[PDB]
């Protein structure tokens, strides 16, 4: 019956368009050759914070790319300048964690950016402590994300949904941010139903939103590390102007 068919709606042309746009936006903002990494302060392994200049540069570059992606998300530009800023301040670290899954490798459980010097493992990232609260769960998070085996379309939708979250602290037009997110969420749900076969599809939407919950917790845990570190002005000195502006001083 037409009545039953309307209940299971295929992906609209507008939904396919949203996906096209987010994929193009990602491809513009994520270089899988990591060529720009050569311009960062060098990684030093040999204080136990010797990697901080390099990882500061890596994060600061990655904030810049996240901003470029965010700007392309449909509807983002209709927000006020203020909500744009608060959404990006709040999400940046989570989108960086999420986008990092593309360099993460199960083989040695590290982020592999194409060089041994630009390969980052548990020993490098654990140097500033918070191993139980932040580092181990971040690695767990990277493993869980690989296990989901997302289509690139799901990956770009999840970054966008992450950014446009109405419950972020300081948001003014919560209704508008919710409406933009719902359009994205509904694209994702229909995408999964239409294009993601079982058994990988099973509960895939719910599992993806659970990854957004886990990211809120990682965000909190990193914020605690950041406040501890940055409280020593000699650490904050090794950071970048964009990191200070976006994450606070």
């Amino acid at each position: 019956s037409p009545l039953k068919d309307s209940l299971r709606p295929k992906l609209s042309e507008e939904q396919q368009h949203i996906i096209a746009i987010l994929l193009d936006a990602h491809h513009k903002t994520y270089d899988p050759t990591y060529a720009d990494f050569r311009d960062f302060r060098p990684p030093v392994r040999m204080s136990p914070l010797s990697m901080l200049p390099h990882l500061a540069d890596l994060v600061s570059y990655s904030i810049q790319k996240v901003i470029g992606f965010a700007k392309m998300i449909p509807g983002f530009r209709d927000l006020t300048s203020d909500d744009q800023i608060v959404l990006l301040k709040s999400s940046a670290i989570e989108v960086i964690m999420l986008r990092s899954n593309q360099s993460f490798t199960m083989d040695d459980m590290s982020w592999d950016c194409g060089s041994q010097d630009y390969k980052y493992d548990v020993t490098d990232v654990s140097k500033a402590g918070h191993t139980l609260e932040l580092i181990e769960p971040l690695i767990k998070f990277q493993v869980g994300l690989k296990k989901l085996n997302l289509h690139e379309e799901e990956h770009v939708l999840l970054m966008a949904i992450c950014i446009v979250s109405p419950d972020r602290p300081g948001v003014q037009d919560a209704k508008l941010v919710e409406a933009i997110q719902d359009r994205l969420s509904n694209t994702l749900q229909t995408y999964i139903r239409c294009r993601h076969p079982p058994p990988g599809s099973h509960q895939l939407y719910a599992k993806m939103i659970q990854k957004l919950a886990d990211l809120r917790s990682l965000n909190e845990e990193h914020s605690k590390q950041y406040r501890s570190l940055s409280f020593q002005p000699e650490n904050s000195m090794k950071l970048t102007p964009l990191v200070l502006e976006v994450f606070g001083n």
């Binding site: 901003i67 470029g68 700007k71 300048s81 203020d82 744009q84 800023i85 608060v86 502006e245 976006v246």
Partner: peptide
């Protein structure tokens, strides 16, 4: 919120 750099990257 005074974020000239973020604001500049946004525009």
């Amino acid at each position: 919120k005074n974020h000239p750099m973020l604001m500049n990257l946004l525009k």
